[PDB]
Amino acid sequence: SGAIYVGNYRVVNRHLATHNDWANLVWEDSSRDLLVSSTTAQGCDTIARCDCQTGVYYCSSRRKHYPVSFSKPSLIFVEASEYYPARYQSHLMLAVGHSEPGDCGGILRCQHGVVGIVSTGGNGLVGFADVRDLLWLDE
Ligand SMILES: NC(=O)[C@H]1CCCN(C(=O)Cc2cccnc2C(F)(F)F)C1
Ligand SMILES: [Zn+2]
User: Fold this and answer.
1) Are residues 7 and 57 in the same domain?
2) CA of 13, closest atom in ligand 1
3) Are residues 101 and 111 located together in one domain of the fold?
4) Fewer beta carbons within 10 angstroms: which end of the chain, N or C?
């Protein structure tokens, strides 16, 4: 679990979106595993606007933050899950590192801010759904 709170937006993994998220839906993209909903209170997180390929992510299955080198956002084949069939997920960044399903939502950050959130993993890899191209979160 985990979310990003910026302005009047709540960014969560689409497969973990709640009834409240869907009733206050702003945008969703199943190929990115992202959903944004509207909130009453203002959020205090800052989205990174950069091409950083190093950062730190929160790993709930380890109660630890880990430093990682990650790939640029691209179309990567994501294995069939209980939430989605086999498919290419776009705007996904891979890193060598630990993850388990309950880790989705953990934030990946650089000096510039929130880079994205854990969305895929397995076999010693962790995939993050990028949020840096979504400039409308700033306004
Ligand atoms: N974006 C996706 O298709 C998600 C759908 C449901 C969640 N999901 C996974 O369970 C992938 C997975 C399997 C084994 C270890 N770690 C992970 C993960 F949690 F992502 F880190 C992929
Ligand atoms: Zn950065």
Assistant:
1) no
2) 1
3) yes
4) C
Owning domain of residue 101: 45-139
Residue type, 28: E
Distance, in Å, from the CA atom of 70 to the CA atom of 92, rounded to the nearest integer, reads 10
The reply to whether 92 and 129 lie within a common domain is: yes
Residue with tokens 């380890």, as numbered in its chain: 62
Asked if 104 is an active-site residue, the reply is yes
Residue 59 assigned as binding residue: no
What distance in Å separates the CA atoms of residue 47 and residue 112, rounded to the nearest whole number? 7
Give phi and psi for 60, each to the nearest 5: -65, -40
- Ion ligand 2 neighbours (CB, 5 A) are 48, 50, 52, 110, 112
Pairwise CA distance, residues 128 & 124, whole Å: 14
Are 63 and 116 contained in the same domain? Answer: yes
> What separation in Å is there between the alpha carbon of 135 and the centre of ligand 1?
26
Residue 6 Cα distances to 21, 76, 80, 93, angstroms:
15, 27, 31, 21
User: Structure resolution in Å?
Assistant: 1.7
Q: Distance between CA atoms of 101 and 44, rounded to whole angstroms? A: 26
